[PDB]
Amino acid sequence: KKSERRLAFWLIAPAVLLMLAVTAYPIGYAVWLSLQRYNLAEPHDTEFIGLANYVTVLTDGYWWTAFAVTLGITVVSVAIEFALGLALALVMHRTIFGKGAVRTAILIPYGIVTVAASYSWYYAWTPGTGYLANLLPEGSAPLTDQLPSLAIVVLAEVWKTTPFMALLLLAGLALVPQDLLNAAQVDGAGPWKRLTKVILPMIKPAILVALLFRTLDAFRIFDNIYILTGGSNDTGSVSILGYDNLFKAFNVGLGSAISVLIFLSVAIIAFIYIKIF
Amino acid sequence: DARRATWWSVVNILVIVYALIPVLWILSLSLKPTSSVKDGKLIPTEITFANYKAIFSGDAFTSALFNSIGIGLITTIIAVVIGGMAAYAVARLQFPGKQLLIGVALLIAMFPHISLVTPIFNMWRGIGLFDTWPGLIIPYITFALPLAIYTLSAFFREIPWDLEKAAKMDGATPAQAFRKVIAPLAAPGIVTAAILVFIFAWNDLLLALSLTATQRAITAPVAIANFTGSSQFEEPTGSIAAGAMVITIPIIIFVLIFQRRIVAGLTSGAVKG
Amino acid sequence: AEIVLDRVTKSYPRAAVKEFSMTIADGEFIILVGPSGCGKSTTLNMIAGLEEITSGELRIGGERVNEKAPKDRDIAMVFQSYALYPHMTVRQNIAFPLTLAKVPKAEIAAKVEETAKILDLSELLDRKPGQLSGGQRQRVAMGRAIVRSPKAFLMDEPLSNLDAKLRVQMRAEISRLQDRLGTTTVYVTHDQTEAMTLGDRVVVMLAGEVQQIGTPDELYSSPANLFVAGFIGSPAMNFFPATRTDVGVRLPFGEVTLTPHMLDLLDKQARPENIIVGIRPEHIEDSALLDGYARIRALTFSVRADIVESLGADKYVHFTTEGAGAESAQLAELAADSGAGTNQFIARVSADSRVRTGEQIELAIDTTKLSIFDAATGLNLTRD
Amino acid sequence: AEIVLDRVTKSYPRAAVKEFSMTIADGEFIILVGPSGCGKSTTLNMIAGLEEITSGELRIGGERVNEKAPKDRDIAMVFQSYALYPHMTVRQNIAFPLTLAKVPKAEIAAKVEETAKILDLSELLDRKPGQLSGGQRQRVAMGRAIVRSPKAFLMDEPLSNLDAKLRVQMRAEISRLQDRLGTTTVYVTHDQTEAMTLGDRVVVMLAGEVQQIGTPDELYSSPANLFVAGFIGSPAMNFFPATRTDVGVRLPFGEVTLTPHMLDLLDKQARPENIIVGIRPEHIEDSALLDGYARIRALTFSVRADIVESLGADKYVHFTTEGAGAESAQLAELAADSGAGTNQFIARVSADSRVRTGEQIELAIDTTKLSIFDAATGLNLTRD
C-alpha cells in the first residue's frame, strides 16, 4: 500500500537527511575550496586559481611519504589484526572455563578511550619511566626514531583494534552448526583440516566485511601518531599531514586538496576491495 | 586430560593479561606520587593521591569532563531515537531502497574524518557555530548513526513477526497495538544501543580537537592532550595518567555491568546463548 | 455464527482463490484441507480480515462484513506459530483481548480464572511464555482465543509445532472442547487425517478451486475427482490404468466385468479408452486368508511383495506391476507431494497372513468397490 | 560388520546409558527407539566414536575399537539436521570423504557418479545445497554417507525434518536401499511406526535401561513390560486396572474367565492383587456386527462414545470408564508423552458400525487377547 511506504519514508527521513547533508555538503564545500586559494591569516586574498594545489601536493615530495607510511601501517596492522582476532575468536568460542571473564577482558580495550591507551603506550616505551623501554639496550629510545616509532604505533593499533575484529569473527563463527564439525570429524578431518575446509571458507562474508572495515579504519589513524610521536621524525601519517598543514600553515587550499585526495584514496581502496572481494 | 586443562588455563590468563596490562600501567602510573617515577609496574612507591587532588583543582578538567558527559548524553539520546526510526524502517517494512541505505550506512562508517573536518571547520566558522555543544552534536550523531542502526536492526529483526497480527486480531488500534505489544519488547535494544553509542561518541579526539577552541565545549580527551603545556606541571606524567584513568573508569563500569548484552549487540544477536 | 460467503474470490497483482461459495452453519467445524500453496490460508485470511476480498459478499452473521476491520467482526484467530507476547504473564496473555475491548477489571480476572480452569493450566497463570513447553504454549494461545467468546473461532494449523504423539491428544482435546464451547469454527490443515478426525464438513481445495465440500464420509465413499480420491487416506488409492474390453474392463493384471448397469453408466459418458480405475488398499486381501465363496469372483492375481511392513494389526504389503498408469494431470498434481513413484502399489493384508519380504502371494481384490475415474477430465463416473 | 558391545556404559558426571549388551550381526537393521531423553542418541554416538565409553567393549569387526578415533573405525553417519556444507556443490559434498581419504581424482569422479546413479540425483550434481529442497537434501546426505562403502551405516533419525506425506516414501526408499547395499545399519528414532516398518530387530530403551530386544513381531505380540506394550502401536493399548476374583480377573466393567490352567499357572507366582489388564484397541469390536456364537463369549458391555472419528476403513470410538488404572511407574513414565488423561480409552470398530458422536454401542471384547501385567514391578505375566 501507499501508507506503508509513506511510513517507511517518514521513519527513514531524519537519518538520511542527516547522513547525506553532513557527509556530502562538507565534501562539496571541500572540493570547491580546493579549486581556490585561501589563508586563515588573511581571508581577503581569495583570488581564484586552477588545479595548482593538486599538482603541488601530488609532486611536493612529502605527500607520498605520508601515503607510504599509512599504507605500511595499515597493511602490517591488518595482517596481525586478522591473525590475532581469529585466535581470540576461537578462544572466546571454544573454551571450557568461564568465558564471561575472557569476553569482559576482551571488551575492556574495545571501549577504552583511544587517548588513554596511547598515553599508556607513550609512558611504557619512555626510557626511564616505563618497562618496555628498560627491557632494551640502555639509551635505546625506541620512540624518537623512524622505524621503532612505526613499530610502537603498529603495536598500539593492533592492541586497540583487535577486539572488534574478534567480535565480528565470532559473530560469523557462531553460525557454523556443530553438526557440520561433527560430520567433518567423522569423515577424517583433523583439528586444522576442519578450520581451513569447513569453517574458514564458510564465513567468507564475515571475514570480508571485517577486513574491509579494518582496512578503511586503519587507513585513517590520527590519535596514536598525534600523541605518540607528534608527526615529527618523518613518521607522520596522512591524516596528521592534512591536520598539520591546515592548522599550522593556515593554507585552506592545500588542506582541502589533501582532504579530497584522502577521500579519493579511500574510495579507490574500497572499490578495489569490492572488485576482488 | 591434564594437557587440555593446562592449555585452557594458560590461554585465558594470556588473554586477560594481554587485555589488562596497558590499563594497569595507567593505574599504577597515576597512583604513584611525583617520586619513584622510575621503573616498576607493581606500584614501587606508596600510593598517594598527589595527582588526582591536583587535576581536579580548577576549571581545567572539571569543565572538560562536564562538556564530555553532556555532549555524550545528548548525542546518544538523539542518535538512538534516529537510529531506532531508521532501524524499524529497514527492519520490517521498507521494500524500495533497503539496499543502498545500508551502503551509505557503511560509507559513513568507513569515512575518513580528516576528509571532512577541513571544510566543516571553515563552514562552521561562519555560522558562528564554532565551539558550542551545537557544533559537536551534529557530526557526533552523524558518525554514530551506523553503529546504532546495526545494533538496533539486530534486535528489531530478533523480535518475532506475528505479534502485529496477533495484536490487531484482539481489537487493538495500530497505535495501541504498537505501544502495548512492541514498545516493551524493544527496550533492551534501545538501552544497549544507547550504551554502545555513548561508548563510541565519547572517545572522538579529531573532531573535538579540530573544532573546539575555548573552555566552553571542550571535550576531555582534548584536555588530556593539552595537559602538556597547561598549569598542571608537578610533572606531566602523574596528571596525564590521572586524567586517562578518570576517563577510562566509566568504560570499565559499563563493561563489567553490561558485557552480557554488549557482546550480543555487537555480534548482531548471534552469540546470545 | 452463520458465515455465508458466496462468490468470494481473490486476485493478486495470478489468482489465489476463485469462486468460493458455502454457508458455514451456526456451529460447524469446517475444515479447509489442500496441498501446500493452495487457496486455503488465503481464504482463512479473507475470512479473518488480514486480507481484502476482491469480489466480496462475506456475511459473518446476516450483514455484508467484507469491509469492516478485524476488530469489529468479533472473530478469534489462533496462529500456527503461537503468536503470544513473551513479556506478559499467562494471565495477561489471556486477558489482553478483554482489556483491549475495555471490560471492567472486576470481570476480566473472573473470566481469566474460569478459562484457565476450563483448560489445563490454572496453575501456570504466573509464568512467562519463554519458560513454557509446547502444549502449554498452545493452550495459552487457545485460552487467549477462547476467553473472548467470539462469533467464529477460526484456527490456522495450530498443531503443527508439536510432536507426533502429542498432536493426536491435542486433536482429541480440540474436538472435545469445541462441543463445550459450541462456536462456528473453520480450520486449515495440510494432512488429511486431521481433516478426517476433527471435522464436520471438510473442504478439499486445489490451486484455488474447490473440488468437493462434504462430510468426511461422503468425501471418502463418494469422491468426485482423482485428487479428492487419492488425497484422503494415508495409504492412498492405487491407480491402475485400464481399457474397455467391450464387456467390462481390463486392468494390467486381470480382467473383470464390473456390472451391467455400471457398464451402461460408463458407456453413457463415453471415453476414448482412457479411464484410470482405482482401488483402495483396504480392499486388497490375501487369497489364502480368503474364505470360500468369495475367492471365486475376487480377481485373484499374484505379485512379488517388495516390502512387507507389519506394523500392528495390518501388514502393508507393497508391490509393483509393470507398464504405466500415471497418465493424468490431476493424478500428477496429486503425486507431486505423495506417491513419489509411477507404479508402486500398497495393499493392506490382515495380520494373520504369512508373508515375508520377497515371497509370492496371491492378492485377491474385491471388484465391487473399485472406483473408475477418467483420464483427461478427472471426474468420477461411479458416484460423483 | 558384526558390532558386538557388552556391558557398555556411560556416566554423565548419574548414568545416561547403563549395561547395554547386544551382538548386532551383519546386514541387520537395528532400530534404537524410546522416549525423548533416553539412552539412544548417547549409545549411537558411543558407537560412532563422538563420545567415550566408560566400562567398554565395542568390537566393530573383531577388535576392541572403543579407543580408535572416529575416522579410523570407518563407520558412516548421516545426521538429523542434514549436516552438509553450503559452500560446496553436491559433487564436492559427496566427494568430501574420498578427498579427505586421498583418493585419485578419476576414482573420485567414478565413485561419485556411481553413487549418484544409485540415487536419483545424477542431474543435481552441480547445484549448491542452498538451491535444493528437503528430499533432495536428504538424498544428498545419504549419498555422502554411502560413497565411502563403510563397515556400519549408522544413522541418527534422518527423516525427522520432512513433511508427514514425504516421510513415508523416504522410509520405503531407505528400506529398499539398505536391502541392496547390505551394510549393518543401526538407527535411532522417536516414533514406533518407523521402528515397525523399517527394522530387522528393534531395541526399546527407557532411561538408559534396555527393556526388550526383539523383532517387530515379538515386540508387539509378546511384550515384556508396560512400556514395550503401550509404547508401540499407534492407537496405544488400553490399561484397565483389575483385581482377582477366584475364577479369573475382574475388570471395572466385566467378568472374564480365561482358563483354570492359566489361573493356577499365574498363581504359582502370587501377586499382591495389583495387576492392570491391558487390551489392544484392535481387539474391541462392535456387537451388532459380531456374528453368532461369538457374542456369547465376548464380554458385551455398553458405553457412551465420546467421539467417533471415522477416518477410513475403521472408526476409533473413544469412551471412558470411571475408576482408576494409572497405578504403575512404567505407565506414568509412558503417559508422560501420550495418554494425557486418567482414563480415555480408544476402541477401533470396523467401518460397518453405524455410530455417531454421543450415541450408544455395546463394544464386545475378545476374552482371548487380553494380557495381564504387574502394577508394582511391571513385567508381563502372560508372555514375557
Coordinates of N, CA and C in Angstrom, one line a residue, chain D residues 59-217:
Chain D
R59 N 33.4 -54.0 19.6 CA 34.2 -54.7 18.5 C 33.4 -54.5 17.2
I60 N 33.7 -53.4 16.5 CA 33.3 -53.2 15.1 C 34.3 -54.0 14.3
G61 N 33.9 -55.3 14.0 CA 34.8 -56.2 13.3 C 35.2 -57.3 14.2
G62 N 36.4 -57.4 14.6 CA 36.9 -58.4 15.6 C 37.8 -57.9 16.6
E63 N 37.9 -56.6 16.8 CA 38.9 -56.0 17.7 C 38.3 -54.9 18.5
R64 N 38.8 -54.6 19.6 CA 38.3 -53.6 20.5 C 38.6 -52.2 20.0
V65 N 37.5 -51.5 19.5 CA 37.7 -50.2 18.9 C 37.0 -49.1 19.7
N66 N 37.0 -49.3 21.0 CA 36.5 -48.2 21.9 C 37.5 -47.2 22.2
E67 N 38.7 -47.2 21.5 CA 39.7 -46.2 21.6 C 40.2 -45.6 20.3
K68 N 39.9 -46.2 19.2 CA 40.2 -45.7 17.9 C 39.4 -44.4 17.6
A69 N 40.0 -43.5 16.8 CA 39.3 -42.2 16.5 C 38.2 -42.5 15.6
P70 N 37.2 -41.6 15.6 CA 36.0 -41.8 14.7 C 36.4 -42.0 13.2
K71 N 37.5 -41.4 12.8 CA 38.0 -41.5 11.4 C 38.7 -42.9 11.1
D72 N 39.0 -43.6 12.1 CA 39.8 -44.8 12.0 C 39.0 -46.1 12.0
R73 N 37.8 -46.1 12.5 CA 36.9 -47.3 12.6 C 36.0 -47.4 11.4
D74 N 35.9 -46.4 10.5 CA 35.3 -46.5 9.2 C 33.8 -46.8 9.3
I75 N 33.0 -45.9 9.9 CA 31.5 -46.1 10.0 C 30.9 -44.8 9.6
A76 N 30.1 -44.8 8.6 CA 29.5 -43.6 8.1 C 28.3 -43.2 8.9
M77 N 28.1 -41.9 9.0 CA 26.9 -41.4 9.8 C 26.2 -40.3 9.0
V78 N 24.9 -40.3 9.0 CA 24.1 -39.2 8.5 C 23.2 -38.6 9.6
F79 N 23.3 -37.3 9.8 CA 22.8 -36.6 11.0 C 21.3 -36.2 10.8
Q80 N 20.7 -35.8 11.9 CA 19.3 -35.4 11.8 C 19.1 -34.2 11.1
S81 N 19.9 -33.2 11.2 CA 19.7 -31.8 10.6 C 20.4 -31.7 9.3
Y82 N 20.8 -32.8 8.6 CA 21.4 -32.7 7.3 C 22.7 -31.9 7.3
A83 N 23.7 -32.4 8.1 CA 24.9 -31.6 8.1 C 25.6 -31.7 6.8
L84 N 25.4 -30.7 5.9 CA 26.0 -30.7 4.6 C 26.4 -29.2 4.4
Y85 N 27.6 -29.1 3.7 CA 28.2 -27.8 3.6 C 27.6 -26.9 2.5
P86 N 27.2 -25.7 2.8 CA 26.6 -24.9 1.7 C 27.5 -24.2 0.8
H87 N 28.8 -24.3 1.1 CA 29.9 -23.7 0.2 C 30.5 -24.7 -0.7
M88 N 29.8 -25.9 -0.9 CA 30.3 -27.0 -1.7 C 29.2 -27.5 -2.6
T89 N 29.4 -27.7 -3.9 CA 28.5 -28.3 -4.8 C 28.2 -29.7 -4.4
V90 N 27.1 -30.2 -4.8 CA 26.6 -31.6 -4.4 C 27.7 -32.6 -4.7
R91 N 28.4 -32.4 -5.9 CA 29.5 -33.3 -6.2 C 30.6 -33.2 -5.2
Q92 N 31.0 -32.0 -4.8 CA 32.0 -31.8 -3.8 C 31.6 -32.4 -2.4
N93 N 30.3 -32.2 -2.1 CA 29.8 -32.8 -0.8 C 30.0 -34.3 -0.8
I94 N 29.5 -34.9 -1.9 CA 29.6 -36.4 -2.0 C 31.0 -36.9 -2.1
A95 N 31.9 -36.0 -2.6 CA 33.3 -36.4 -2.7 C 34.2 -36.1 -1.5
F96 N 33.6 -35.3 -0.6 CA 34.4 -34.9 0.6 C 35.0 -36.1 1.4
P97 N 34.3 -37.2 1.7 CA 35.0 -38.3 2.3 C 36.2 -38.9 1.5
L98 N 36.0 -38.9 0.2 CA 37.1 -39.5 -0.6 C 38.3 -38.6 -0.7
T99 N 38.0 -37.3 -0.9 CA 39.2 -36.3 -1.0 C 39.8 -36.2 0.4
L100 N 39.1 -36.4 1.5 CA 39.8 -36.5 2.8 C 40.5 -37.8 3.0
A101 N 40.1 -38.8 2.2 CA 40.8 -40.1 2.2 C 41.9 -40.3 1.2
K102 N 42.2 -39.2 0.4 CA 43.3 -39.2 -0.6 C 43.1 -40.2 -1.6
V103 N 42.0 -40.1 -2.4 CA 41.7 -41.0 -3.5 C 42.0 -40.3 -4.8
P104 N 42.5 -41.1 -5.8 CA 42.7 -40.5 -7.1 C 41.5 -39.8 -7.7
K105 N 41.7 -38.7 -8.4 CA 40.6 -37.9 -8.9 C 39.7 -38.7 -9.8
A106 N 40.3 -39.5 -10.7 CA 39.5 -40.3 -11.5 C 38.6 -41.3 -10.8
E107 N 39.1 -41.9 -9.7 CA 38.3 -42.8 -8.9 C 37.3 -42.0 -8.1
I108 N 37.6 -40.7 -7.7 CA 36.6 -39.9 -7.0 C 35.4 -39.7 -7.9
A109 N 35.7 -39.2 -9.2 CA 34.6 -39.0 -10.1 C 33.8 -40.2 -10.4
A110 N 34.5 -41.4 -10.6 CA 33.8 -42.6 -10.8 C 32.9 -43.0 -9.7
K111 N 33.4 -42.9 -8.4 CA 32.6 -43.3 -7.3 C 31.4 -42.4 -7.1
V112 N 31.6 -41.1 -7.3 CA 30.6 -40.1 -7.1 C 29.5 -40.3 -8.2
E113 N 29.9 -40.6 -9.4 CA 28.9 -40.9 -10.5 C 28.1 -42.2 -10.1
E114 N 28.8 -43.2 -9.7 CA 28.1 -44.5 -9.3 C 27.1 -44.3 -8.2
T115 N 27.5 -43.5 -7.2 CA 26.7 -43.2 -6.0 C 25.4 -42.4 -6.5
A116 N 25.7 -41.4 -7.3 CA 24.5 -40.6 -7.8 C 23.6 -41.4 -8.7
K117 N 24.2 -42.4 -9.4 CA 23.3 -43.3 -10.2 C 22.5 -44.3 -9.3
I118 N 23.1 -44.7 -8.1 CA 22.3 -45.4 -7.2 C 21.0 -44.7 -6.7
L119 N 21.2 -43.4 -6.4 CA 20.1 -42.5 -6.1 C 19.6 -41.9 -7.3
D120 N 18.7 -40.9 -7.2 CA 18.0 -40.3 -8.3 C 18.4 -38.8 -8.5
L121 N 19.7 -38.4 -8.2 CA 20.1 -37.1 -8.3 C 21.4 -36.9 -9.2
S122 N 21.5 -37.7 -10.2 CA 22.6 -37.6 -11.2 C 22.5 -36.3 -12.0
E123 N 21.4 -35.6 -11.9 CA 21.3 -34.3 -12.6 C 21.6 -33.1 -11.7
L124 N 21.4 -33.2 -10.4 CA 21.7 -32.2 -9.4 C 23.1 -32.2 -8.9
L125 N 24.0 -32.8 -9.7 CA 25.4 -33.0 -9.3 C 26.2 -31.7 -9.4
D126 N 25.6 -30.5 -9.6 CA 26.3 -29.3 -9.8 C 25.6 -28.1 -9.1
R127 N 24.6 -28.3 -8.3 CA 23.9 -27.2 -7.6 C 24.2 -27.3 -6.2
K128 N 24.4 -26.1 -5.6 CA 24.7 -26.0 -4.2 C 23.5 -26.4 -3.3
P129 N 23.7 -26.9 -2.1 CA 22.6 -27.3 -1.2 C 21.6 -26.1 -0.9
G130 N 22.0 -24.9 -1.0 CA 21.1 -23.8 -0.8 C 19.9 -23.8 -1.7
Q131 N 20.2 -24.0 -3.0 CA 19.1 -24.1 -4.0 C 18.6 -25.5 -4.2
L132 N 18.2 -26.2 -3.1 CA 17.7 -27.5 -3.2 C 16.5 -27.6 -2.3
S133 N 15.8 -28.7 -2.2 CA 14.6 -29.0 -1.4 C 14.9 -30.0 -0.3
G134 N 13.9 -30.3 0.4 CA 14.0 -31.2 1.6 C 14.5 -32.6 1.2
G135 N 13.7 -33.3 0.4 CA 14.0 -34.7 0.0 C 15.3 -34.8 -0.8
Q136 N 15.6 -33.8 -1.6 CA 16.9 -33.8 -2.4 C 18.1 -33.6 -1.4
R137 N 17.9 -32.7 -0.4 CA 19.0 -32.6 0.6 C 19.2 -33.8 1.4
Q138 N 18.1 -34.5 1.8 CA 18.2 -35.8 2.5 C 19.0 -36.8 1.6
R139 N 18.6 -36.9 0.4 CA 19.3 -37.8 -0.5 C 20.8 -37.4 -0.7
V140 N 21.1 -36.1 -0.7 CA 22.5 -35.7 -0.8 C 23.3 -36.2 0.4
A141 N 22.7 -36.1 1.6 CA 23.3 -36.5 2.8 C 23.5 -38.1 2.8
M142 N 22.4 -38.8 2.4 CA 22.6 -40.2 2.4 C 23.6 -40.7 1.3
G143 N 23.7 -40.0 0.2 CA 24.7 -40.3 -0.8 C 26.1 -40.1 -0.3
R144 N 26.3 -38.9 0.4 CA 27.6 -38.7 1.0 C 28.0 -39.8 2.0
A145 N 27.0 -40.3 2.7 CA 27.2 -41.4 3.7 C 27.3 -42.8 3.0
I146 N 26.9 -42.9 1.8 CA 27.0 -44.2 1.1 C 28.4 -44.3 0.3
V147 N 28.9 -43.2 -0.2 CA 30.0 -43.3 -1.2 C 31.2 -44.0 -0.6
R148 N 31.4 -43.9 0.7 CA 32.6 -44.4 1.4 C 32.7 -45.9 1.5
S149 N 31.6 -46.6 1.2 CA 31.5 -48.1 1.4 C 32.0 -48.5 2.8
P150 N 31.3 -48.1 3.9 CA 31.8 -48.2 5.2 C 31.5 -49.6 5.8
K151 N 31.9 -49.8 7.1 CA 31.6 -51.1 7.7 C 30.3 -51.1 8.5
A152 N 29.7 -49.9 8.8 CA 28.5 -49.8 9.5 C 27.8 -48.5 9.1
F153 N 26.6 -48.5 8.6 CA 26.0 -47.3 8.0 C 25.1 -46.7 9.0
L154 N 25.6 -46.4 10.2 CA 24.8 -45.9 11.3 C 24.2 -44.5 11.1
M155 N 22.9 -44.3 11.4 CA 22.3 -43.1 11.1 C 21.4 -42.6 12.3
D156 N 21.2 -41.3 12.3 CA 20.6 -40.6 13.5 C 19.3 -39.9 13.0
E157 N 18.2 -40.6 13.0 CA 16.9 -40.0 12.7 C 16.9 -39.1 11.5
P158 N 17.3 -39.6 10.3 CA 17.4 -38.7 9.2 C 16.1 -38.2 8.6
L159 N 15.0 -38.8 8.9 CA 13.7 -38.4 8.3 C 12.8 -37.7 9.3
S160 N 13.4 -36.8 10.1 CA 12.6 -36.1 11.1 C 12.2 -34.7 10.6
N161 N 12.9 -34.1 9.6 CA 12.7 -32.8 9.1 C 11.9 -32.8 7.8
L162 N 11.1 -33.8 7.6 CA 10.3 -33.9 6.3 C 8.8 -34.0 6.6
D163 N 8.0 -33.5 5.7 CA 6.6 -33.5 5.9 C 6.0 -34.9 6.0
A164 N 4.9 -35.0 6.7 CA 4.3 -36.3 7.0 C 3.9 -37.1 5.8
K165 N 3.8 -36.5 4.6 CA 3.4 -37.2 3.4 C 4.6 -37.7 2.6
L166 N 5.8 -37.1 2.8 CA 7.0 -37.5 2.1 C 7.8 -38.4 3.0
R167 N 7.7 -38.4 4.3 CA 8.4 -39.3 5.2 C 8.1 -40.7 4.9
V168 N 6.9 -41.1 4.5 CA 6.6 -42.5 4.3 C 7.3 -43.0 3.0
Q169 N 7.4 -42.2 2.0 CA 8.1 -42.6 0.8 C 9.6 -42.7 1.1
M170 N 10.1 -41.8 2.0 CA 11.5 -41.8 2.3 C 11.8 -43.1 3.1
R171 N 10.9 -43.5 4.0 CA 11.0 -44.8 4.7 C 11.1 -45.9 3.8
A172 N 10.2 -46.0 2.8 CA 10.2 -47.0 1.8 C 11.5 -47.0 1.0
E173 N 12.1 -45.9 0.7 CA 13.3 -45.8 -0.1 C 14.5 -46.3 0.7
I174 N 14.6 -45.8 2.0 CA 15.7 -46.3 2.8 C 15.6 -47.8 3.0
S175 N 14.4 -48.3 3.2 CA 14.3 -49.8 3.5 C 14.5 -50.6 2.2
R176 N 14.3 -50.0 1.0 CA 14.7 -50.7 -0.2 C 16.1 -50.5 -0.6
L177 N 16.8 -49.5 -0.1 CA 18.2 -49.2 -0.4 C 19.2 -50.0 0.5
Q178 N 18.9 -50.0 1.8 CA 19.7 -50.8 2.7 C 19.7 -52.3 2.3
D179 N 18.6 -52.7 1.7 CA 18.5 -54.1 1.2 C 19.5 -54.4 0.1
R180 N 19.7 -53.5 -0.8 CA 20.6 -53.7 -1.9 C 22.1 -53.4 -1.5
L181 N 22.3 -52.5 -0.5 CA 23.6 -52.2 -0.1 C 24.2 -53.4 0.7
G182 N 23.5 -53.7 1.8 CA 23.9 -54.8 2.7 C 25.0 -54.4 3.7
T183 N 24.7 -53.4 4.4 CA 25.6 -52.9 5.5 C 24.9 -52.8 6.8
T184 N 25.6 -53.2 7.9 CA 25.0 -53.1 9.2 C 24.6 -51.6 9.5
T185 N 23.3 -51.4 9.8 CA 22.8 -50.1 9.9 C 21.9 -50.0 11.2
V186 N 22.5 -49.4 12.2 CA 21.7 -49.1 13.4 C 21.0 -47.8 13.1
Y187 N 20.0 -47.4 13.9 CA 19.1 -46.3 13.6 C 18.3 -45.9 14.8
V188 N 18.3 -44.6 15.1 CA 17.6 -44.1 16.3 C 16.4 -43.3 15.7
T189 N 15.3 -43.5 16.4 CA 14.0 -42.8 16.0 C 13.1 -42.7 17.2
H190 N 12.3 -41.7 17.2 CA 11.4 -41.5 18.4 C 10.1 -42.1 18.3
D191 N 9.5 -42.3 17.1 CA 8.2 -42.9 16.9 C 8.3 -44.4 16.6
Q192 N 7.2 -45.1 16.9 CA 7.2 -46.5 16.7 C 6.9 -47.0 15.3
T193 N 6.2 -46.1 14.5 CA 5.9 -46.6 13.1 C 7.2 -46.8 12.3
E194 N 8.2 -45.9 12.4 CA 9.5 -46.1 11.8 C 10.1 -47.4 12.3
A195 N 10.0 -47.7 13.6 CA 10.6 -48.8 14.2 C 9.9 -50.1 13.7
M196 N 8.7 -50.1 13.3 CA 8.0 -51.2 12.8 C 8.0 -51.5 11.3
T197 N 8.1 -50.4 10.5 CA 8.2 -50.6 9.1 C 9.6 -51.0 8.7
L198 N 10.6 -50.2 8.9 CA 12.0 -50.5 8.5 C 12.7 -50.9 9.8
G199 N 12.9 -52.2 10.0 CA 13.6 -52.8 11.1 C 13.7 -54.3 11.1
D200 N 14.9 -54.8 11.3 CA 15.1 -56.2 11.4 C 15.1 -56.7 12.8
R201 N 15.4 -55.8 13.8 CA 15.4 -56.1 15.2 C 15.4 -54.8 16.0
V202 N 14.4 -54.6 16.8 CA 14.2 -53.3 17.4 C 14.7 -53.4 18.9
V203 N 15.1 -52.2 19.4 CA 15.6 -52.1 20.8 C 14.8 -51.0 21.5
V204 N 14.0 -51.3 22.4 CA 13.2 -50.3 23.2 C 14.0 -50.0 24.4
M205 N 14.4 -48.7 24.5 CA 15.2 -48.2 25.7 C 14.4 -47.3 26.5
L206 N 14.6 -47.3 27.8 CA 13.9 -46.4 28.7 C 14.9 -45.9 29.8
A207 N 15.2 -44.6 29.9 CA 16.1 -44.0 30.9 C 17.4 -44.7 30.9
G208 N 17.9 -45.3 29.8 CA 19.1 -46.0 29.7 C 19.0 -47.5 29.7
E209 N 18.0 -48.0 30.5 CA 17.8 -49.4 30.6 C 17.1 -49.9 29.3
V210 N 17.6 -50.9 28.7 CA 17.0 -51.6 27.5 C 16.0 -52.5 28.0
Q211 N 14.7 -52.3 27.6 CA 13.6 -53.1 28.1 C 13.5 -54.4 27.3
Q212 N 13.5 -54.4 26.0 CA 13.4 -55.6 25.2 C 14.1 -55.5 23.9
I213 N 14.7 -56.6 23.4 CA 15.4 -56.6 22.1 C 14.8 -57.7 21.3
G214 N 13.9 -57.4 20.4 CA 13.1 -58.4 19.7 C 12.7 -57.8 18.3
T215 N 12.4 -58.8 17.4 CA 11.8 -58.4 16.1 C 10.5 -57.7 16.3
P216 N 10.1 -56.9 15.3 CA 8.9 -56.1 15.4 C 7.6 -56.9 15.5
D217 N 7.7 -58.2 15.6 CA 6.6 -59.1 15.8 C 6.6 -59.6 17.3

